[PDB]
Nucleic acid binder design. Structure first.
Lengths: 242, 243, 243, 242, 243, 243
DNA sequence: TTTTTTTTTTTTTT
DNA sequence: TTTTTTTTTTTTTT
């Protein structure tokens, strides 16, 4: 009777039926498309220049705009106050239709990752610090929003190399900005940062082709997707990392 | 007096089959698969199978807290989950023998659940890609706790151990990701929390030994005589040196 | 010159028999085995032996908390445990002396408990396989604290020490598994929790020296003259170098 | 002016003046003389036999007489109840004029330490367990009341040998019976047990001559106070102990 | 073919000067050195320089909590600290920007602070002797976070990196001593707390590149062309292998 | 503008003596010895010296909690302590600059305190015998925190370090015994709590360098030129390898 | 960031 | 003895 669970198992699996359901029940959190829609809406023609300012502001000062405003120059405070009021900026994790410095940096990952080369020594974990862990550490990987640039169709060994090279940074960064991860083990830090990382790697924002074009442009992969010597070095550094 | 009674009681031959029936009957039981199927049929009627398939995808990719997952979901999804909560009177955690949870549905219907893992691989808390980094071509059919429900316990001990150590490589990763209070603990400490539910499913009376080995053969996990595949052997070893 | 012979007499001359009578009279007695068997016969009647066998399997593979174990068990098992709780008025932990617990049943009937361990080996908190990893072909009859009640204290000291060190290898593992705080403590700290109950049963008045040695002989633990087996000798050494 | 603390320092120290003061301000805790006075008072002619019973009772069952009574034989419970009522026994640490099983064992250290040879395998830390740490561990040292048998006039190296040999046991025992010391470091256990140990070693109860006569009788020292091979072995085992 | 050149342009072509203006404009500014000196002159009058010297000694050897330090100090000292608190309206921690703290005084007057370190060396939380154990003849002028304000950012990159790594060896020690939770954390975790304030002062508009290099030359940290000294080179290497 | 003022302020030569006066004046101060003596003389009158001797024995062998020690003391002792509490208005712990404690009395009169240690050696929390086990013939005059008050800081650095490392061997033991919350901490962690009060007493203005070296010479701790004794040298080394 | 004499003998399958 | 998407960037001599 009840061991008819065999008949239920016997039915061949439908890739499209299951893919409709996984799509319907999917975690709906960060919408990069909505963020860009809101920036364009509040900023108008100035949205790009203000977004670049907000990327610098997020990467070097954090996600609390009213707090950072208090320990800043006269000119800076005036710019941040204008941005808070134009873009109706918030702190932390508000509703889906609300903008934060984090969300701006995350939706515009292509622009954020390019800025890291210049901003490297102004970050919580500097390029110099990373170079101590792995020589000539890839600066374009030094932000959680880099996960949105990873082509998931890349050969598994090449893909794992990029993510292990990026995880070397995440391990340092997470232990430093997440109060719950201060001094915790590698395995613990990776268990808290892999699920949001892998969601960004397998998101529908930016096609595989565009993602690999960015990795090629940043000099992270070659013509066939083979990671650079620096990525390979970093990927190994993560395997023996503490 | 009572010493003579203790000797005469011990003088009686050990009944291997009587004790083996009892150890089975009193064994740990995480859920009654038969009661779960009985409840799905009762609440769902003729739609119970299609709704069970939905709940398998829902459990595997979103978890066991239906009202919580509903908060970070689309309008359509939110409506499907709300309808399922109300039809099947779904609960979170470990409720009574007469209550349904997304976990229990996936666990009672292990044969289908394990088959879905091939498609759902990159949407799981621990992806197939991640597992391949630990052990090459990691068996996707093993990437769910309900896989223990498909293991034939009559398999030769060495073959049986290799299947379970392979599966344990996944369990070790999965437990650290889905359970935050197991993240800083050792391999031995994490294994201590997942071996009892695993071994219960392996030694349960739900789905016979013959049918269970037929599944392992079909999933390509064992050969004609029950010898595990190279991938299973590789993962069992990866688990022995795992941290 | 008299004070010298006085400190000499008060230090060297000890009334070994007077002290040995007292230590036995004051020894921890959570229960009297004779009273336990008297209570089983009283509540169970003609079925007391079959129910006692069930309670031994239940105590060895599930523990001493009958209402707790009942919740993660099959429909049939739960119904058997509930029936046993109500017939024998079973309790958890350490109640009064006219009270029965699964532990006390297994302890009073040590002769059958120890015989069941051969069949139940892979269902115990510490399996026979796990023990074999510490000492080859570990004696299964020693894999329960109630084994101490089977030990003949009149055995030659060296033979008696081999039996107890061999049994202590198991106790060391068992205590760490059934008491998680002990996992990070020393052999000496873990030993401190199990040596007093062990030595009390070894020197108890329940079952004579002659019968106790006839059990050790029957279990194949000692020879005709009380010389321990190769497996016992191996286990006794494994304990000396154990951590 | 105020640097006249030099004139205060300049006064030569008086050994007898200081010894009167240390005597007057001394810690007044356990009075072995009062304990024996109370045993004789309540027990009469039976005080010695009842004291021997109470030593066995303390060493193998503890210091809680009403508690131990509940998990004991009919005969034993009857004896313990009679002892509780004759000697007005208490649990824990009551007033100076109150008897406890601990205080009885401690005041009659000579009798207690002799009983350890027979009681060895009934103790929280057995002789067998100790033999695993140091071969043929001295059974007479396996009780805190042994500190009352130590001659403090012994040559420093011989004296330290006896106390290091005894401390090997105290380390095991303290970690086991003191809930606050469960799994703590050697240095921590020794910091909590050295002050009460050293007080018993330097107490006025039992003269130096009698103390050394006991150590000689127990076979712990030779004619000149040189410790035995077992004590020497144990003293070393404590130096490398964890 | 245009989308290719578009991803190429949006990845490689970065407006280095636009971004560098912004990072400087938004940089953490707990205080403006010019405002600190303006406030010292305003409250202190003609005595502002002598009182500032006192506050530098007070900040370097006692900390940033003036009312706290006052309690474990001599009669004369306590009276001096109380007078300074009331004249300069001193605060603890990180107050508003028109507020003075011992730290802000030492930071705005980096040129004298760093010069005082030669005399104050054995009175600091991390002594010169301690530093000499990590790197021989460690540069005493680098033994304060305010040293970063003395660093010329126009220096050749390799020379600039030697100065900062040499200074970071001190910062690593100092942070562990003045923040006890950091003692059990990694170089990278400890570095994360001191690199942002360091790099902000290195790239601040207070004191020109030309003057900053004239300080490094005067302190004997660099030569005529900006090449660091043997001690700086030694300290830069000690930091690379530091734990 | 303010940049030019910062350069001209730094252009002024470093006044070594002005800074050295200030670092002394602002240095940590556990107690004012002068105020303690002033208070003893005020409350005690002509009996202040004899009562101070009593309080030194009381602090050294019983501690700093006078009402607490009174509970485990003789009738006579109890009366002496109660009389001293009421005459000198004695307090426990670390009260105001104008309050007396047994510790402060012993600390302000270090010359006498250190001389008493020879007689009181076997009555201290850490005995002379215990210390001799760590380092042969350990200097008894060093067996009190107030010994730091006798150290000449003008001594050659290597000689000065050997005296303090020797003394630190005792401090390490003493702190673990008198302070229960320092028992599980490392050498570095315990040293972190006792170096600041030690170094304050070493660099205090109470009792000149000349008088302090005269004491070290008298106690046999240094020779004619300040070279420490073999016992001091031995203890300094014992501290380097201490746990 | 301090300040001087341990505590006190049977558990029980997460 | 459990059950699926981190948190969010300046401290300050015990």
């Amino acid at each position: 009777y009840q061991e008819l669970a065999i008949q239920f198992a016997a039915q061949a699996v439908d890739r499209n039926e299951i893919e409709q359901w996984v799509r319907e029940f999917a975690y709906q959190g960060f919408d990069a498309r909505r963020v860009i829609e809101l920036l364009k809406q509040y900023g108008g023609a100035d949205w790009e220049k203000d977004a670049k300012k907000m990327i610098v502001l997020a990467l070097t000062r954090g996600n609390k705009p009213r707090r950072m405003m208090m320990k800043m120059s006269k000119e800076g405070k005036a710019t941040v106050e204008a941005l808070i009021n134009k873009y109706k900026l918030k702190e932390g994790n508000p509703s889906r239709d609300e903008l934060t410095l984090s969300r701006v940096a995350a939706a515009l990952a292509g622009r954020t990752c390019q800025a890291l080369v210049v901003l490297s020594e102004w970050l919580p974990v500097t390029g110099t610090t990373m170079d101590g862990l792995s020589p000539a550490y890839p600066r374009h990987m030094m932000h959680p929003s880099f996960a949105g640039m990873v082509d998931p169709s890349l050969p598994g060994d090449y893909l794992r190399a990029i993510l292990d090279a990026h995880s070397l940074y995440l391990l340092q960064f997470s232990r430093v900005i997440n109060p719950n991860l201060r001094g915790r083990t590698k395995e613990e830090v990776a268990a808290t940062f892999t699920q949001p990382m892998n969601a960004a790697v397998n998101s529908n924002f930016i096609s595989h082709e565009k993602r690999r074009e960015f990795l090629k442009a940043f000099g992270l992969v070659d013509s066939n997707g083979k990671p650079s010597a620096a990525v390979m070095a970093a990927a190994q550094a993560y395997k023996t990392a503490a």
